[PDB]
Design an enzyme around this catalytic site. Structure first.
Site, short mmCIF file in Angstrom:
data_model
loop_
_atom_site.label_atom_id
_atom_site.label_comp_id
_atom_site.label_asym_id
_atom_site.label_seq_id
_atom_site.Cartn_x
_atom_site.Cartn_y
_atom_site.Cartn_z
N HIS A 145 6.46 -0.71 2.99
CA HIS A 145 6.47 -2.06 3.53
C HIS A 145 5.69 -3.07 2.49
O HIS A 145 4.59 -2.49 2.43
CB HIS A 145 6.11 -2.03 4.85
CG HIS A 145 4.98 -1.74 5.18
ND1 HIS A 145 4.44 -0.17 4.78
CD2 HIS A 145 3.87 -1.93 5.96
CE1 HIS A 145 3.20 -0.21 5.29
NE2 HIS A 145 2.85 -1.02 6.04
N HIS A 156 3.46 -6.62 2.40
CA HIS A 156 2.89 -7.57 3.18
C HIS A 156 2.93 -9.04 2.29
O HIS A 156 2.48 -9.13 1.22
CB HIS A 156 1.29 -7.20 3.45
CG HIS A 156 1.16 -6.01 3.94
ND1 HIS A 156 1.05 -5.80 5.26
CD2 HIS A 156 0.98 -4.87 3.43
CE1 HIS A 156 0.89 -4.42 5.38
NE2 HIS A 156 0.78 -3.96 4.25
N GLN A 158 0.87 -1.03 0.05
CA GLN A 158 -0.06 0.03 -0.12
C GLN A 158 0.83 1.11 0.05
O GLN A 158 1.56 1.64 0.97
CB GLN A 158 -0.78 0.09 1.12
CG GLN A 158 -1.29 -1.25 1.50
CD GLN A 158 -1.45 -1.22 3.19
OE1 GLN A 158 -2.51 -1.96 3.56
NE2 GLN A 158 -0.50 -0.97 4.08
N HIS A 166 6.21 4.14 6.10
CA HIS A 166 7.56 3.32 5.78
C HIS A 166 7.19 2.39 4.57
O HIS A 166 5.98 1.47 4.99
CB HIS A 166 7.90 2.62 7.04
CG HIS A 166 9.32 2.18 6.97
ND1 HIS A 166 10.08 2.46 7.83
CD2 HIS A 166 9.88 1.35 6.19
CE1 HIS A 166 11.56 2.09 7.59
NE2 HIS A 166 11.02 1.26 6.39
#
Lengths: 126, 126
Positions: free
Chosen positions: B95, B97, B82, B93
């Protein structure tokens, strides 16, 4: 022209091709500017890409995301890779969906209209 | 120990750290083995990573995905980033998933239990 699973994409709809990857416009985007970035080499699963194809798949995805977020006026991007059958992979070829996002944001194109989003998009790529 | 947005992750829950990235167990996984892979350097948006951080973020994501899909017995993986506020980014930050997937597959852990999934996971990483 370009191989994607077991379909042959015409370059008219391909707006970027790097050393190891390519990017295409969607025949049925989920949202405007919903594009896909795939490795040229036809492999079904992400663990199959040699490390370079990976660095090249995602460097290219960085670039493309920026272009479609701009051109399509989004303020964020969603990147998502359905890696395998139990994750959603219909067409069996590694591929990242890049969708531009809009404040509270939330089908079938003609070979020529897609051909138009493509030419528009090629322009941002030097 | 490790910086993630404006939270400080303890290494006890970090199961991989490469030259430019790190991987952590989720305090509230969406599904079993829901882990995250982030760049060490704290940037909010994906276009902010230099090209190497990108090749290193996603090479590491390849590796991790494979481990959690194995250890957690999934048959596919879902990768999703996202990128930005209108796309779902809560913690600011970059990232990714990584969630393992199961045939027709479809909360709060203790610092010590997470600390356990972590040690389990470190093992697959040489």
């Amino acid at each position: 022209s370009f191989r994607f699973g077991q379909h042959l994409i015409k370059p008219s709809v391909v707006f970027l091709k790097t050393e190891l990857s390519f990017a295409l416009v969607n025949r049925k985007p989920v949202v405007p500017g919903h594009v896909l970035v795939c490795p040229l080499r036809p492999v079904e699963r992400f663990h199959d890409l040699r490390p370079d194809e990976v660095a090249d798949l995602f460097q290219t995805t960085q670039r493309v995301g920026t272009v479609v977020e701009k051109h399509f006026h989004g303020t964020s991007l969603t990147f998502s890779m359905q890696d395998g059958p139990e994750a959603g992979q219909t067409v069996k070829h590694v591929h990242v969906h890049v969708l531009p996002r809009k404040a509270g944001d939330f089908s079938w194109r003609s070979e020529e209209e897609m051909a138009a989003e493509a030419a528009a998009l090629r322009v941002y790529f030097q």
